Chain A
Amino acid sequence: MPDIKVELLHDDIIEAYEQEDLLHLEVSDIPKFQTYIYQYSKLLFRWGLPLERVKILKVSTDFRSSYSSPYNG
């Protein structure tokens, strides 16, 4: 009876334990989120809802800073 060595490589359970995000989204997964969010934020500012455009632009810029100024000065 000899010794048997087993080494797991790329286990899906370990990789699921090694992240906190619900999905592993990338730029190619959602190809044109930026333009759609920007144009809907502009249409939101056409309406009387200025908070919601800030919310949607914050979601867009959070993802943009995740995968990679007039408000300063």
Chain B
Amino acid sequence: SSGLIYTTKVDKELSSIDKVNDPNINGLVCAGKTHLGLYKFSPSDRSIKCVHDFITIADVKTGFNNYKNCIAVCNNSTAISIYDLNKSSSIDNPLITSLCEHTRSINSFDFNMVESNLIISGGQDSCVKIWDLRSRSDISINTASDSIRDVKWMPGYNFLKSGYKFASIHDSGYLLKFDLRQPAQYEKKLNAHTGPGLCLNWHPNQEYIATGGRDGKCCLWFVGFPKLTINTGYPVTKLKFKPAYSSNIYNSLLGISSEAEVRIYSLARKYIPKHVLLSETPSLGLVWWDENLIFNIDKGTRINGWDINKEPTVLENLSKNTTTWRDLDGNGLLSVDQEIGSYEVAIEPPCIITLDIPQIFNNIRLTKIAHSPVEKFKYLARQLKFSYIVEAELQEKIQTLVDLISIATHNASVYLSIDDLTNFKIWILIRDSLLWDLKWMTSSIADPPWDTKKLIKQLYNQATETGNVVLTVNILFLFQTIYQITEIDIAKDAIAHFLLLLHRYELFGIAADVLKYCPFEDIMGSEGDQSSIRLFCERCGELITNESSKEKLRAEAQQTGNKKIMDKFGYWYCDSCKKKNTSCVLCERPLKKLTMVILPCGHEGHFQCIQEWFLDENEQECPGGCPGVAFI
């Protein structure tokens, strides 16, 4: 990344990483099962070296003040191994002292920032022990609670309660704060996240404790009802504060990690992470060396160091506006009106702006020259006639030209009726070109411009460049088979897009009229019949296909000539069980042409009968003795 400075990889096993709390040094410590050592980073070559190698979840936190040359590593469960930094390359052992009091394993510990001799401890025994260096623990408070997950001291930074306070979290989701000067049962018992609370941390300036949890939440609690809540969604395990002054509570940075990534959030914008350091492998721990340096380890066993002032932010790559269209002319046009806020200091809710673009444009035009396209689209959809409906082929072509001339005359008449001359002239040109082709067929290098094919193709191209959808789809219906205008794919795509545009408005009957007489047979779907309904009989259970009746009526209509005999065919009778008719549920009359089926019980009905029973009588039950209330 851009903010990456140090990327040194150590092939040994790593479990935790911390730093030496000393300004005049550039060393950082590491951990592991059987590997403890201190690593020195050099900002000149941007590399990390090794200093001295000495050789269950715990810290690798170092000491403070005169005990800054000491580290604590849990060796075996209830083992407190205090090592040394000065006594590394010498005859004397790095180990200083060993402490063991806990019955169970030790989970977390912290060195005090003010009284360097006092070392805290805590594990699954629900005991908080203070160990005195310059002197068995000092004070052991057995709260008899669940297993303690994390113990941290009060940060006595160099910016009375400086190093005499500490907090712990249990598996019962309870936050306990105690005072070292006056221990008691509980100084402040506060609730926490439900289930096992995993981690907590202290604000360096104000009395605020942010607690993580396995539920995926990191709530900021006032310890002077959380003041803040970040639903991270993943079990928070590690968090490290930025060691800087913060007068305002919102003017702070919080690093949240669990697949674990270093996500440096902010306390004024809890919904957007400020800096993300995801590396390439899931992380095991992270640490802040200074206000601008952050160090971490990951599953790739690489010690990595970043500078937060060279790393970019998420906020940047966050879209600030979007635009959508509702229809052709611009009746609906949205654009998000929001103000780009900062990481410092809430956010005013954005106003989503819709505009009637044709209405405002017409108002602007009428104001300037003083010194409804949707209704027109509906009208021209409904009233224009999109549909069309060796000597014999010539006669058929002659009749096709004649009634296409009539259709063009009708389309010009409706355009002249709505007083639109610019499209009236188009259909007059089309009619005159068809008259030219008709007289050329009757009387029987580059083409002239007034030819009946070139003029129609040029008018279609001008229409599809202008955007007049109605005319450019009408020409594609009426003049496709006889005159090859364009590719079949483009024509079918244009028919389909006009149908979808018609469906976008509430004009479905016009879409049905367009689709019924379309010469292209595969516009919407390829399965054939998708409104076809097949029924089984109510008395025998066989499928009502009625092949025998259809065959007999087809033969009879073929013999007698007239096709009205085929109107006797229907699916209201069964030819296998000899069912006579299907009856209405209300009036018990024969039912042949149109039904209204009540859904949950499956009963028939005339339109008038069912509408009478369900609207005029205001009855909510089926009119056939059905307990299922098929109301309205």
Contacts and interface: CB of A to CB of B under 8 A. Distances in A.
A17 B369 CA distance: 8
B368 A6 contact: no
Interface residues of A, number: 9
B368 A14 contact: yes
Contact of B361 (A4, A8, A17): A8
Nearest to B360: A6
B314 interface: no
A5 to B, nearest CB: 11
Contact of B337 (A2, A8, A13): A2
A8 B351 contact: no
Contacts of B365: 8, 11, 13-14
B355 A8 contact: no
A26 to B, nearest CB: 19
B353 interface: yes
Nearest to B362: A13
B533 interface: no
A22 interface: no
A8 B369 contact: no
Interface in A1-39: 1-2, 4, 6, 8, 11, 13-14, 17
Interface string B322-355: 0000000000000001000000000000010101
B343 to A, nearest CB: 24
Contacts of A2: 337, 351
Contacts of A6: 355, 360-361, 364
Contacts of B355: 4, 6
Interface residues of B, number: 10
Interface string B357-373: 00011001100110000
A14 to B, nearest CB: 6
Interface in B359-403: 360-361, 364-365, 368-369
Contacts of B351: 1-2
A6 B364 CA distance: 9
A23 B110 CA distance: 88
Contacts of A11: 361, 365
Contacts of B353: 4
Nearest to B355: A4
Contacts of B337: 2
A1 B352 CA distance: 9
Contacts of A8: 361, 364-365
A57 to B, nearest CB: 27
Nearest to A13: B365
A8 B365 CA distance: 9
A58 B351 CA distance: 63
B125 to A, nearest CB: 62
Interface string B510-537: 0000000000000000000000000000
A46 to B, nearest CB: 28
Nearest to A7: B364
A2 B355 CA distance: 13
A65 to B, nearest CB: 29
Nearest to B369: A17
A13 B361 CA distance: 10
B175 to A, nearest CB: 44
Nearest to B368: A14
Contacts of B360: 6
A4 B360 CA distance: 11
Contacts of A14: 365, 368-369
A31 B469 CA distance: 34
A8 B355 CA distance: 14
Nearest to A18: B369
Contacts of A1: 351
Contacts of B364: 6, 8
Nearest to A1: B351
A62 B365 CA distance: 33
A11 to B, nearest CB: 7
A14 B364 CA distance: 10
A6 B337 CA distance: 15
A2 B337 CA distance: 9
A42 B172 CA distance: 111
A17 to B, nearest CB: 6
A10 B365 CA distance: 12
Nearest to B364: A8
Contacts of A4: 353, 355
A47 B369 CA distance: 51
A38 to B, nearest CB: 25
7 contacts: A2-B351, A6-B364, A11-B361, A11-B365, A13-B365, A14-B368, A14-B369
Given A2-B351, A4-B353, A11-B361, 9 more contacts: A2-B337, A4-B355, A6-B360, A8-B361, A8-B364, A11-B365, A13-B365, A14-B368, A14-B369
Give the 10 A-B CB pairs with smallest separation, nearest first.
Answer: A17-B369, A8-B364, A13-B365, A6-B360, A1-B351, A2-B337, A4-B353, A2-B351, A14-B365, A14-B368
